Curated annotation (Swiss-Prot), chain C:
<comment type="function">
    <text>Calcium-permeable, non-selective cation channel with an outward rectification. Seems to be regulated, at least in part, by growth factors, like IGF1, PDGF and morphogenetic neuropeptide/head activator. May transduce physical stimuli in mast cells. Activated by temperatures higher than 52 degrees Celsius; is not activated by vanilloids and acidic pH.</text>
</comment>
<feature type="repeat" description="ANK 6">
    <location>
        <begin position="8"/>
        <end position="34"/>
    </location>
</feature>
<comment type="similarity">
    <text>Belongs to the transient receptor (TC 1.A.4) family. TrpV subfamily. TRPV2 sub-subfamily.</text>
</comment>
<protein>
    <recommendedName>
        <fullName>Transient receptor potential cation channel subfamily V member 2</fullName>
    </recommendedName>
</protein>
<comment type="subunit">
    <text>Homotetramer. Interacts with a cAMP-dependent protein kinase type II regulatory subunit (PRKAR2A or PRKAR2B) and ACBD3. Interacts with SLC50A1; the interaction probably occurs intracellularly and depends on TRPV2 N-glycosylation.</text>
</comment>
């Protein structure tokens, strides 16, 4: 398993291929918030890729991805992931769900622990 | 005046700088030129864009 | 079909710039299509964040890097009373 396969299946949005993901992180003590699964360009987390490539109002694999990073137990939470670039310093996935003008994805985000400040 | 200054002088001739950047449109790679406009009356995400993330010049 | 040259050496965009016909020139210079017929577009959208939006205009045979561009044809080759109204429309104004 690599990072770009996760980015392809989270850009397509279909929720099957994340099975086999979770225990894989539990095999090697990885998290979805480090520099290994997020990009070195800006810090774009796979949750942010999921909200950026949503289809018709709701990306169907967001709540599986928040379920996976709920059950894996990260020290820094997934929905509070912010970019570390000097262009995007502090930009979250809640800003993407508000920017993409969808009530459903911001409702799914703030129902699962998204800080609103 | 800029079209006659782009040639340079008659003794030395200036290099021809290319304008814009060679980007890929969905491979339909063209030399494009970005403008940035602020429209307070669209509010429609039913339009496909090339990139997903904003980026500076 | 746009890249076909006639016996004077001009494409339809350069013929609209030489003849000074601004409405077809404005329409060719910034046309956007949706879904299918997308590679025959010239004004794309790079990104959009709320109100701000970056439009990528195509300058194939527009800027002066080419040997016979649209800008050279408007400035030096056209004889029209609306020759000055063509350098003020987008993307030629910002270019």
């Amino acid at each position: 398993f690599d990072r770009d396969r996760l980015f392809s299946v989270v850009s397509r949005g279909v929720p099957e291929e994340l099975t086999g993901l979770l225990e894989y992180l539990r095999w090697n003590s990885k998290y979805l918030t480090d520099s290994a699964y997020t990009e070195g360009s800006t810090g774009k987390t796979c949750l942010m890729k999921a909200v950026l490539n949503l289809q018709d109002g709701v990306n169907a694999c967001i709540m599986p991805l928040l379920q996976i990073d709920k059950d894996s137990g990260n020290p820094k939470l997934l929905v509070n992931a912010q970019c570390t670039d000097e262009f995007y310093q502090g930009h979250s996935a809640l800003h993407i769900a508000i920017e993409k003008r969808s009530l459903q994805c911001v409702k799914l985000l703030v129902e699962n622990g998204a800080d609103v400040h | 005046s800029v079209l006659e200054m782009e040639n340079g002088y008659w003794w030395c001739r200036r290099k021809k700088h290319r304008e814009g950047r060679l980007l890929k449109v969905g491979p339909d790679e063209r030399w494009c030129f970005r403008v940035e406009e602020v429209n307070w009356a669209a509010w429609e995400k039913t339009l496909p864009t090339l990139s997903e993330d904003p980026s500076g010049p | 079909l746009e890249e076909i040259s006639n016996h004077q050496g001009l494409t339809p965009l350069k013929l609209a710039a030489k003849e000074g016909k601004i409405e077809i020139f404005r329409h060719i210079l910034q046309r956007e299509f949706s879904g299918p017929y997308q590679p025959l577009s010239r004004k794309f959208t790079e990104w959009c964040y709320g109100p701000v939006r970056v439009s990528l205009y195509d300058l194939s045979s527009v800027d002066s890097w080419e040997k016979n561009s649209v800008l050279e044809i408007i400035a030096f080759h056209c004889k029209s009373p609306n020759r000055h109204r063509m350098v003020v429309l987008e993307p030629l104004n910002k270019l």
